[PDB]
Amino acid sequence: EPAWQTRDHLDDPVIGELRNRFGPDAFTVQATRTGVPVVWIKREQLLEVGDFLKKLPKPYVMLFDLHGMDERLRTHREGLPAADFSVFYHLISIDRNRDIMLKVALAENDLHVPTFTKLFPNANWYERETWDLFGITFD
Amino acid sequence: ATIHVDGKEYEVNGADNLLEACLSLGLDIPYFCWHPALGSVGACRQCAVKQYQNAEDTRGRLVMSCMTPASDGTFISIDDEEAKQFRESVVEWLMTNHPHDCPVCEEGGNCHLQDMTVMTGHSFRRYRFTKRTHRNQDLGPFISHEMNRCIACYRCVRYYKDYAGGTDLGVYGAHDNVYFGRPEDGTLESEFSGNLVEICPTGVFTDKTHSERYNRKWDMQFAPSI
Amino acid sequence: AFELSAAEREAIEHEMHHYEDPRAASIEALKIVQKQRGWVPDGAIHAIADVLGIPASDVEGVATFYSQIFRQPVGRHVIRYCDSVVCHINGYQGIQAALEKKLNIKPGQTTFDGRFTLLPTCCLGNCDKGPNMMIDEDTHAHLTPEAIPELLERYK
Amino acid sequence: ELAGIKDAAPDATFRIRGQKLAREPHRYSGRTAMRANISVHEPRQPQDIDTMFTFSMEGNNQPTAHRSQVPFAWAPGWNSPQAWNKFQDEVGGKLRFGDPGVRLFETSENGLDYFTSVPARFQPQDGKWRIAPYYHLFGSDELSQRAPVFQSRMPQPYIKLNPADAAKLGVNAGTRVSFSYDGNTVTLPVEIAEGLTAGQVGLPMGMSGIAPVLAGAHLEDLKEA
Amino acid sequence: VACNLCAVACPVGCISLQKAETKDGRWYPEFFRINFSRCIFCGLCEEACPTTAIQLTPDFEMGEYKRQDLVYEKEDLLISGPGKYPEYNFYRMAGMAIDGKDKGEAENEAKPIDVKSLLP
Amino acid sequence: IIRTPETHPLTWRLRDDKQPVWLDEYRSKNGYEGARKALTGLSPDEIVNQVKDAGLKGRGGAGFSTGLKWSLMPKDESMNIRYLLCNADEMEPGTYKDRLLMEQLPHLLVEGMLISAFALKAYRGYIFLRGEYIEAAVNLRRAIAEATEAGLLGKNIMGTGFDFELFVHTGAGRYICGEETALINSLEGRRANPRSKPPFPATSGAWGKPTCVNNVETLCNVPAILANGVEWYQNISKSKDAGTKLMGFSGRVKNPGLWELPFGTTAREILEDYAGGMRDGLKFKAWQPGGAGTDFLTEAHLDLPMEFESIGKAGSRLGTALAMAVDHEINMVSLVRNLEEFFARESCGWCTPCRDGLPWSVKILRALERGEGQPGDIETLEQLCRFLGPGKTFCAHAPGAVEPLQSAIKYFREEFEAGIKQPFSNTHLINGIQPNLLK
Ligand SMILES: NC(=O)C1=CN([C@@H]2O[C@H](COP(=O)(O)OP(=O)(O)OC[C@H]3O[C@@H](n4cnc5c(N)ncnc54)[C@H](O)[C@@H]3O)[C@@H](O)[C@H]2O)C=CC1
Ligand SMILES: Cc1cc2nc3c(=O)[nH]c(=O)nc-3n(C[C@H](O)[C@H](O)[C@H](O)COP(=O)(O)O)c2cc1C
Ligand code: SF4
Ligand code: SF4
Numbered sequence A: 001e002p003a004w005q006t007r008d009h010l011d012d013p014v015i016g017e018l019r020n021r022f023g024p025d026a027f028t029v030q031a032t033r034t035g036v037p038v039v040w041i042k043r044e045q046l047l048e049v050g051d052f053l054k055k056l057p058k059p060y061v062m063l064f065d066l067h068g069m070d071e072r073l074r075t076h077r078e079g080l081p082a083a084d085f086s087v088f089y090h091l092i093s094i095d096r097n098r099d100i101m102l103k104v105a106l107a108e109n110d111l112h113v114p115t116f117t118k119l120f121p122n123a124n125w126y127e128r129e130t131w132d133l134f135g136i137t138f139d
Numbered sequence B: 001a002t003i004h005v006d007g008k009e010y011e012v013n014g015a016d017n018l019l020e021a022c023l024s025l026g027l028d029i030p031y032f033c034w035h036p037a038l039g040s041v042g043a044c045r046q047c048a049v050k051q052y053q054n055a056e057d058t059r060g061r062l063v064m065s066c067m068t069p070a071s072d073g074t075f076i077s078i079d080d081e082e083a084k085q086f087r088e089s090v091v092e093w094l095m096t097n098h099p100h101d102c103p104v105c106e107e108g109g110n111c112h113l114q115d116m117t118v119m120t121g122h123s124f125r126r127y128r129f130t131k132r133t134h135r136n137q138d139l140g141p142f143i144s145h146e147m148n149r150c151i152a153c154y155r156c157v158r159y160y161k162d163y164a165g166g167t168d169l170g171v172y173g174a175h176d177n178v179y180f181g182r183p184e185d186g187t188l189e190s191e192f193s194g195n196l197v198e199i200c201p202t203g204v205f206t207d208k209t210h211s212e213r214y215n216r217k218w219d220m221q222f223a224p225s226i
Numbered sequence C: 001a002f003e004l005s006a007a008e009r010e011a012i013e014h015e016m017h018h019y020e021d022p023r024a025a026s027i028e029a030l031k032i033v034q035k036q037r038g039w040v041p042d043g044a045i046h047a048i049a050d051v052l053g054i055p056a057s058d059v060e061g062v063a064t065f066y067s068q069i070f071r072q073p074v075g076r077h078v079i080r081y082c083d084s085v086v087c088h089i090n091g092y093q094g095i096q097a098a099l100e101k102k103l104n105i106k107p108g109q110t111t112f113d114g115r116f117t118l119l120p121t122c123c124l125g126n127c128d129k130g131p132n133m134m135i136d137e138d139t140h141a142h143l144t145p146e147a148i149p150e151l152l153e154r155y156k
Numbered sequence D: 001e002l003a004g005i006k007d008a009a010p011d012a013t014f015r016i017r018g019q020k021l022a023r024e025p026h027r028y029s030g031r032t033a034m035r036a037n038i039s040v041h042e043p044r045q046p047q048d049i050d051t052m053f054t055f056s057m058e059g060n061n062q063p064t065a066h067r068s069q070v071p072f073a074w075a076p077g078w079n080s081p082q083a084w085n086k087f088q089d090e091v092g093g094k095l096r097f098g099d100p101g102v103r104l105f106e107t108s109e110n111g112l113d114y115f116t117s118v119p120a121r122f123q124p125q126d127g128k129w130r131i132a133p134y135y136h137l138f139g140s141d142e143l144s145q146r147a148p149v150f151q152s153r154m155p156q157p158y159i160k161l162n163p164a165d166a167a168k169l170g171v172n173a174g175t176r177v178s179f180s181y182d183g184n185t186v187t188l189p190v191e192i193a194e195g196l197t198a199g200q201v202g203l204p205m206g207m208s209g210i211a212p213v214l215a216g217a218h219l220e221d222l223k224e225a
Numbered sequence E: 001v002a003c004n005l006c007a008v009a010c011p012v013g014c015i016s017l018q019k020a021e022t023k024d025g026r027w028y029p030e031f032f033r034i035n036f037s038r039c040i041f042c043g044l045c046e047e048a049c050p051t052t053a054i055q056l057t058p059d060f061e062m063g064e065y066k067r068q069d070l071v072y073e074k075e076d077l078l079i080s081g082p083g084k085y086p087e088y089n090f091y092r093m094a095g096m097a098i099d100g101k102d103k104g105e106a107e108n109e110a111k112p113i114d115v116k117s118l119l120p
Numbered sequence F: 001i002i003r004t005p006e007t008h009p010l011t012w013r014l015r016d017d018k019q020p021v022w023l024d025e026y027r028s029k030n031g032y033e034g035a036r037k038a039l040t041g042l043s044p045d046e047i048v049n050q051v052k053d054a055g056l057k058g059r060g061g062a063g064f065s066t067g068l069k070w071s072l073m074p075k076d077e078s079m080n081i082r083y084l085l086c087n088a089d090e091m092e093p094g095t096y097k098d099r100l101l102m103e104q105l106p107h108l109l110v111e112g113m114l115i116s117a118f119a120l121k122a123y124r125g126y127i128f129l130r131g132e133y134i135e136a137a138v139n140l141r142r143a144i145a146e147a148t149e150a151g152l153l154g155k156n157i158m159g160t161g162f163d164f165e166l167f168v169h170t171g172a173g174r175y176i177c178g179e180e181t182a183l184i185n186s187l188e189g190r191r192a193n194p195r196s197k198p199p200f201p202a203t204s205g206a207w208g209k210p211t212c213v214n215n216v217e218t219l220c221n222v223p224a225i226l227a228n229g230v231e232w233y234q235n236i237s238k239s240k241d242a243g244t245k246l247m248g249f250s251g252r253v254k255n256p257g258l259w260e261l262p263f264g265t266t267a268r269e270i271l272e273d274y275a276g277g278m279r280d281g282l283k284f285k286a287w288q289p290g291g292a293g294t295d296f297l298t299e300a301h302l303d304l305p306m307e308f309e310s311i312g313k314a315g316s317r318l319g320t321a322l323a324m325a326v327d328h329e330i331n332m333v334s335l336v337r338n339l340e341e342f343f344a345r346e347s348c349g350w351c352t353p354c355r356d357g358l359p360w361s362v363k364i365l366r367a368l369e370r371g372e373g374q375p376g377d378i379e380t381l382e383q384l385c386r387f388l389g390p391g392k393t394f395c396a397h398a399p400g401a402v403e404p405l406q407s408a409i410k411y412f413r414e415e416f417e418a419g420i421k422q423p424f425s426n427t428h429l430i431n432g433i434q435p436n437l438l439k
């Protein structure tokens, strides 16, 4: 298998831990060529998922990235939740040498997510830049 | 009708052929000789897909999607390795004699043959022999003629004779010396001869009035007018 | 300035009587003009089109599709030697070399006096008696390179 | 009566997910050099307050965009006119979200009455010539003759004459005859028209000097000059 | 050959040209202008040229007093020789017939065969 | 060799001096008896069923059942216009059987056309004959005139009221005209491009009417079936293919000729007992069973019966059953180059793989002939053989084109590998640009 092959990364133990903690219907696994598991989480469970990843036996300790995407003109969204905008959170676990990309789907009118700064202080500037360039409000 | 393309089920119109049914679904099949307004003839042999007899079948058979009806319970594959190899081979056979003309050809950036050469993935030339050459004809003040760029897809003769009812454009010659044009130099007499520049997938027939002050398609400012 | 003779037009119309479509007499009309004139000139295409009621492009496409309808001038005699597989096994190449040596021309060309035009043709259906050639209407078999100069002198 | 022209196209506030419709492709080039010979400073992008299109590539031209007015067809991988297949709901059918244009009227519930004004048959009167209109695709429309590429395609200005009338007037094919319409004598070369009925002279409508209003008018003193 | 590939490959859009044609049929630029106040000297236009006409040369001394004089027209660009590619000729490969090179005289091209030819 | 009418239905009435048999001598030697029986005592459906259970297969080279092809003309009575076409093109290299059939026995073909047109209810019959057969055309026209003046053709044949008109259509020299849909297109006065099937010619053929195209030898087998019965024809040979076939070996043999043999006769008997074996100083190397469009076979396949199934199971085709012998003096690359040159120049130009891939194989074999082959040439030839097979081209001309190439590459690869001498070079050096050295 080549390194650029599209993988859903369902064999990642983080997917099994998330399924055991939150349930099989709590999130949607997306197959990408990013090399990391992309997991679409509901907005109301975002802080719970972040805390669960922070309190893992080999935890996800660094918020690598946090930004947004305008999904309104994206024609090919097969296997994706209905989203006008999306916010992605890239988290790196150094102990596992792994990373996970959480994604939160937002409608055009309800453009607000809970703030991530109580878990990761770099989310301050990351959410400020997301609000500046996309208009997404972080409560 | 119910068809299965690459393992995915689709509902189509059973009176349609597989090429127009799959193009209506957004699937990409290369094609040259077929036109929606002109019907299917099976000439260019570019639209080959692999059809299977039933749900469980591994051999299959390369069929012609423009010549195959999209009947109920059909099973075809576009991204099959043999089908992709044959479509690339058909593009390669068309490109054996094609002139090195894209910079000085008015169909550049608007060429169906360019699009399907790129889309099949053919970019390496192993043919090392000569390319056949044709003299050109004067077709009047509107259509510019360059027979070297022809792929013998028979769209021009089919449109101009069968569709538009014209009588002064035909196909001549033989095996690989087929010539598409008028029997002698002269103006194209049909009142709808200008549609040849869009019917022809190559730069054989080009807009001469556009060619006088030529610019590429990406450089145009377009509007929808009447 | 081409005009059809009375005999040519009558033969073409009599050929048109045999078919339910006048288009079906195009090959025989071209062959009639070729038999009367040696080859089919440019005006003959339009004359046959006007007699038959089909476009001139169809007549030109038919005349250029078929190898035995000549749209270019030929000599007074047409040598057609077979270069197919059984005559290649039987050695047509010596026959072709002898023809090129005597006539001093390549295949597809005409002699300087307009007497002979040399042409390769497909299999003549005489493979058991190969190598075969066909001068204007006579097919000659069991050809040898030494019999070519004697055979060519009987076609003045 | 013209109240249906409002639905021909949406107004200037029509947007596709908030953005206008692109007039030019996204790879439009030469933006900082095409006007540089006049001035090196790039001017303002032209504002289109009238319609929903923008004079720039900063717009929408997606095949799946909910619109009917498509300035041009382009899909990634389909640069030819075959991108219209991507712009249709089914290939060879209509556009995906309907075709542009709205009929101004529906068909009536009731028809008209029969027209009882049956004309008499054409009588060729002596000394007058009925002008039969001859139309040309290259030459009859007013704006098309101004196009300089059409002069190579427009036919020479002729006058069509029946063989019996031309023999009566002693004129062959190609000779010049002069006729006066509205007190204006012009000359044209004669073309013999076998299918034209006698007592009629055929004039090419919409050409230079021959108005299309002359169709059906009578012609006087048509005589070889 | 005024094929407009350099102008579209430019990420700054600082190339502007128009195609003209001679009587024999060869293509050439009617004008060719480059905004050097906009050019970032990235070399994508030289990379995109299918005839190796446009080239970037070892010359950096390009300072100017007025920005209007940084628009270089065709008389400021066309040099008297081939430059970095000394022997390439696109028209020796193209099938389009020009002066001094008829049909079938290009590289890897056979002579044209009439449909009226007697050979099968 | 004695030729009784029982075991030689086609060639027992051939004259010893190779002269044509005219109407009086033909009728003396049991002529038009089957035509009389068919046109007086049998229904057209009865004749069609008799041909169907007689096992008469197509002698053109495909082996399709003639009765089955006759059955699927439409049963509608409104389609009163019907056409029967005789495929006297015979442009395949190595095939000369139909020339012997119609040059000296034209009345057999006329009688078979009459019987088949009565069975098919065909109102007209055309003989699409190649233009190179001059004496065949003369003899056919003379036989048609003799049958018309004696009441065998025209209006009210034998008083039964069946009107049948027979014409001879001389071709203009193109190999693709033998394809039956291209034969119909050429009969209509068009370019002889074939037609996509379905619809088959039996439903909508010549001018949109029901049309049946059949070979000369099939319509020559018909009168013997109608004159001697189905039981006689099914008991000629104890093989799956019923009846007799014109077989024969050609090319550097002692007796190159053409004989009528029952099906199941092995190819060694035709080469040795009939053709006399190979010539002096020549050793047998290979053979083609059915003309230029069939796979080459080695000496190990010489002990194989000449049936469709047996040669088909060996990796070849029976074809026209006119085998051609290749000795050790013939270079296989040059022979395949000659074959491919014929096939490339007799392409009709309709479809891309044949039209634009047979010249590629021609150029590769020309390079291999003079030792200018390069690595990848034989692989290109094999890919051309795989991608010009059945279903990949518009008609069956290109599969027959690539059959000898793939069989010769399979059996004589050491001759093709001898032509690869030069290294591969598609590009020349361009000064100033470093090439991309692919490994
Ligand atoms: N000069 C000659 O005798 C030559 C003979 N051939 C032979 O031609 C053969 C290929 O001929 P094709 O017609 O292309 O192929 P084919 O085998 O598909 O057709 C042969 C006959 O069967 C009939 N047929 C087949 N399937 C039918 C169906 N479902 N319904 C009704 N009719 C049907 C066709 O109409 C035709 O008459 C080869 O086997 C080859 O040996 C090839 C070249 C030259
Ligand atoms: C390329 C090609 C050429 C053919 N040429 C001939 C031919 O010359 N004569 C012939 O009888 N059949 C020829 N055939 C076979 C016909 O298609 C058809 O099978 C035959 O003419 C009549 O069928 P039958 O065998 O039942 O009589 C050719 C087929 C192909 C594909
Ligand atoms: S017709 Fe197409 S492929 Fe051919 S030279 Fe023109 S742009 Fe290039
Ligand atoms: S000239 Fe154009 S439309 Fe006609 S066959 Fe050639 S490529 Fe097709």
Ligand code: SF4
Binding pocket: E006, E009, E010, E011, E012, E013, E014, E015, E034, E038, E039, E040, E041, E042, E043, E044, E045, E046
């Ligand atoms: S080098 Fe300059 S002109 Fe050329 S592509 Fe780059 S920015 Fe444009």
Ligand code: SF4
Binding pocket: B103, E001, E002, E003, E004, E005, E006, E007, E017, E045, E048, E049, E050, E051, E052, E053, E054
């Ligand atoms: S400089 Fe090169 S890329 Fe630019 S238009 Fe001229 S030939 Fe084309």
Ligand code: SF4
Binding pocket: F176, F194, F346, F347, F348, F349, F350, F351, F352, F354, F355, F393, F394, F395, F396, F397, F398
């Ligand atoms: S294979 Fe294709 S191009 Fe070749 S003869 Fe048949 S239809 Fe014509």
Ligand code: FES
Binding pocket: B019, B030, B031, B032, B033, B034, B041, B042, B043, B044, B045, B046, B047, B064, B065, B066, B067
């Ligand atoms: S598009 Fe189907 S063969 Fe040409």
Ligand code: FES
Binding pocket: C082, C083, C084, C085, C086, C087, C088, C122, C123, C124, C125, C126, C127, C130, C131, C132, F093, F094, F095
């Ligand atoms: S191969 Fe020459 S006559 Fe048949």
